[PDB]
Ligand binder design. Structure first.
Ligand SMILES: CCNC(=O)[C@H]1CCN(C(=O)c2cncc(Cl)c2)CCN1Cc1ccc(Br)cc1CC
Ligand SMILES: CCNC(=O)[C@H]1CCN(C(=O)c2cncc(Cl)c2)CCN1Cc1ccc(Br)cc1CC
Ligand SMILES: [Cl-]
Lengths: 305, 306
């Protein structure tokens, strides 16, 4: 038993991280097959960053302006091009450690593991969710750009995030691996702000089920509610709407625990209205919203990769 | 910016995990060079587990009674020995993925990454602390024995924990990689219970420093305390004593933030008395005690957001 914020094992991704240097800038790249992916802002000076014309900046660069190192081994760049906000550096060697992989664009509420890297060297791993406002609450310092987020299924790595910048409130923004930003952000040093965030309701419900599975039951009650009535409550507390699809996805946990989703919604309503009265749930005094239903089932059933 | 429970990248350890089978029992082992390390309880059946005589159980085994599988490949066992509560199986292949490594026994309050594994395959990675009562609060199911805990400061893997069992209260117990249990526990299914746990004071202070580094000062106050008066108060909330060693090791964080250690102690006293009044610190409504001073320096900026 026990329930922890758990990341995927990162080894398959570690073997893909490289150092990319362009002029005075060093950041991280992802080496898959014979391409290295990194943020296109790698080509910008501080002045350029204020209002970049990426096409024009890139025309002045040769392949030899991009220095790529995989550990202690230099990779030779043989082509360069952009896709959206990602730079693709074609190299002369396919990564022998390329895992089975896909590029996947995730939706708000979905979780993933982040491999924080500096100077092409993996430094740490942690779990994140894509927030409703399309930021992530990561942990990143100067030099972390090009760090990636991913999930694993069996042997297949699904890459979903590449890190581009930190916003003024200290949360993080980035792209999918095709260079499309999550959220209304641009790769320019200009005033930008996260929208007001909301809580991921389906994930809070999943975590309440995790708590029950782990023996924490004090918040259960005799009551139930309807989807419509509960959604009035969610709106009041800045929670995301709960959909029928969310209810459906939680069906296994409902069956396992004997607590219907709308019964657990009655528990959640009471927590929102009354607080925890000095108690905790799975060691938290807050309602945790960065475990998905799948995360709960995975961790409670010992799935491996 | 940000502050997360941050594990070490697990790849160097993933390449060392194997499955060990003896009779009907299968669990995880750690393959380093030409040795596989695993809990000695692998040689017990359910009928043996209450009062095992490990010497007597082991003498009845041959090398070929141990099956070791590394992915799809069977390794051949060519020797075995018991060291404390760990079994060491000598195999006829050195692991080509052996990282630079060492074995370290840690003290209560120290943190490490756990790679939870089943059938020699990794499931996930998370951070744990060695609690004052010599347990860890992990996430482990049936089949997780022989999963390990480690740090990877500076490219070398320091292995510090091997998982042996879950105790009745749902917390976890295990050994160092020399097979010595943390705490008073034994590898027998007899009644044993962890002592009452306490909060790791030095770690809470480190985390308050992290909060200041990351730009928040709301919980500070104008007061100070002596070390002795701090300890007299904090013990009333089931906090561990703060020693002069702890004060010394908080020195770098104190210097970076301009907040004397005993002034941060006065802040903590007031938080214990008042609670948060609806605020949070680094995304938590409780005082977090599973980040060490070293962990904070590892993860936070060297420049305070003033
Ligand atoms: C030389 C020109 N490049 C830059 O200026 C880089 C420098 C590196 N950075 C980091 O390494 C870092 C990452 N995570 C967290 C922290 Cl604290 C720092 C920050 C990102 N900026 C670009 C930038 C900055 C603000 C905004 Br708004 C948008 C953009 C464009 C997407
Ligand atoms: C067949 C004989 N071996 C056993 O019974 C094994 C079964 C495997 N186990 C697990 O895989 C597991 C690990 N973590 C968490 C969970 Cl929930 C289970 C639990 C450990 N026990 C031994 C045991 C059990 C209680 C105590 Br007290 C001491 C000891 C001796 C160290
Ligand atoms: Cl009702």
């Amino acid at each position: 038993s026990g329930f922890r914020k758990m990341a995927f094992p990162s080894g398959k991704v570690e073997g893909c991280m490289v150092q990319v240097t362009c002029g005075t800038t060093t950041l991280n790249g992802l080496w898959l097959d014979d391409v290295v992916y990194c943020p296109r802002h790698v080509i910008c000076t501080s002045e350029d960053m204020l209002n970049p014309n990426y096409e024009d900046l890139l025309i002045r660069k040769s392949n030899h302006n991009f220095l790529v190192q995989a550990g202690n081994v230099q990779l030779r760049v043989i082509g360069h091009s952009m896709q959206n906000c990602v730079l693709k550096l074609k190299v002369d060697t396919a990564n022998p450690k390329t895992p089975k992989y896909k590029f996947v664009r995730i939706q708000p509420g979905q979780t993933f593991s982040v491999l924080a890297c500096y100077n092409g060297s993996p430094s740490g791993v942690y779990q994140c969710a894509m927030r409703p406002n399309f930021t992530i609450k990561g942990s990143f310092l100067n030099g972390s750009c090009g760090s990636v987020g991913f999930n694993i299924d069996y042997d297949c790595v699904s890459f979903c995030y590449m890190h581009h910048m930190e916003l003024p409130t200290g949360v993080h923004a980035g792209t999918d691996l095709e260079g499309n930003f999550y959220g209304p952000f641009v790769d320019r040093q200009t005033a930008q702000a996260a929208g007001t965030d909301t809580t991921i309701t389906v994930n809070v419900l999943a975590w309440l089920y995790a708590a029950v599975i782990n023996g924490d039951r004090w918040f259960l009650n005799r009551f139930t509610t309807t989807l419509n009535d509960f959604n009035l409550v969610a709106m009041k507390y800045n929670y995301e709407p709960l959909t029928q699809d969310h209810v459906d996805i939680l069906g296994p946990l409902s069956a396992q625990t004997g607590i219907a989703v709308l019964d657990m919604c009655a528990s959640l309503k009471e927590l929102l209205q009354n607080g925890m009265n000095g108690r905790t749930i799975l060691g938290s005094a807050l309602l945790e919203d960065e475990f998905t239903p799948f995360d709960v089932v995975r961790q409670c059933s010992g799935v491996t990769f």
